[PDB]
Amino acid sequence: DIMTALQLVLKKSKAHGGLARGLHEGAKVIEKHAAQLCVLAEDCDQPDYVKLVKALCADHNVSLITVPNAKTLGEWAGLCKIDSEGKARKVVGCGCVVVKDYGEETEGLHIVQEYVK
RNA sequence: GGAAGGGCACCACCAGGAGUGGAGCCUGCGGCUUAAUUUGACCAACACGGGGAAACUUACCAGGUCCAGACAUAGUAAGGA
Numbered sequence: 534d535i536m537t538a539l540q541l542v543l544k545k546s547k548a549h550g551g552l553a554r555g556l557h558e559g560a561k562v563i564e565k566h567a568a569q570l571c572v573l574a575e576d577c578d579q580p581d582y583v584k585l586v587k588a589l590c591a592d593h594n595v596s597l598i599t600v601p602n603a604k605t606l607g608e609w610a611g612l613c614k615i616d617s618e619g620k621a622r623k624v625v626g627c628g629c630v631v632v633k634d635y636g637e638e639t640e641g642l643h644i645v646q647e648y649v650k
Numbered sequence: 651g652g653a654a655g656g657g658c659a660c661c662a663c664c665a666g667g668a669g670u671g672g673a674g675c676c677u678g679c680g681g682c683u684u685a686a687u688u689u690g691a692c693c694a695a696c697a698c699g700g701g702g703a704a705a706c707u708u709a710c711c712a713g714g715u716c717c718a719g720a721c722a723u724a725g726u727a728a729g730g731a
């Protein structure tokens with residue numbers, strides 16, 4: 534249920550628009566201290582990318598979660614075009630995702646907060 | 651109709667007034683010139699387009715910006731369009 538909870542929280546944040554995508558924006562948002570959580574994709578070919586993400590998250594004391602596939606993280610971040618037929622096409626991978634505000638409390642928020650802690 | 655008859659009009663005349671046409675200047679038109687000298691109009695065009703334009707107006711000419719190219723599909727793309 535942890536993965537489903539994370540997906541639900543990310544989708545609700547996207548609906549509220551309180552989430553950031555990409556490291557170039559992720560570092561800025563995290564340094565603002567407004568980042569309440571960070572999500573990193575495991576499928577990264579740049580060790581410096583993951584090292585910087587982890588170091589910044591640890592330094593700024595921000596909850597960190599990992600995802601196996603970056604394309605799945607991008608899909609959960611809304612970086613796709615939804616077709617009436619079914620799952621959205623034209624997906625683009627998203628290495629990192631950050632959250633500024635959850636908008637409203639949700640069932641998955643509690644599960645995520647319990648897991649990360 | 652350089653045919654006849656009847657009638658009528660100061661955008662016709664008669665009887666007259668002011669005149670205009672001549673001079674200087676203002677303003678519109680043609681021509682010429684010009685990078686352009688934007689252009690319509692030739693009784694019923696020509697101080698007309700309410701048109702007396704320094705910029706704007708502006709339509710012309712010599713140059714420099716910008717998209718204020720919705721929407722759909724495809725491509726690129728958060729390792730950033």
Ligand SMILES: [K+]
Pocket residue numbers: 670
């Ligand atoms: K005279």
Ligand SMILES: [K+]
Pocket residue numbers: 698
């Ligand atoms: K006139």
Ligand SMILES: [Mg+2]
Pocket residue numbers: none
């Ligand atoms: Mg006369």
Ligand SMILES: [Mg+2]
Pocket residue numbers: none
């Ligand atoms: Mg007379």
Ligand SMILES: [Mg+2]
Pocket residue numbers: none
């Ligand atoms: Mg005279």
Ligand SMILES: [Mg+2]
Pocket residue numbers: none
């Ligand atoms: Mg002229």
Ligand SMILES: [Mg+2]
Pocket residue numbers: none
């Ligand atoms: Mg007449």
Ligand SMILES: [Mg+2]
Pocket residue numbers: none
């Ligand atoms: Mg001009």
Ligand SMILES: [Mg+2]
Pocket residue numbers: 708
């Ligand atoms: Mg002018």
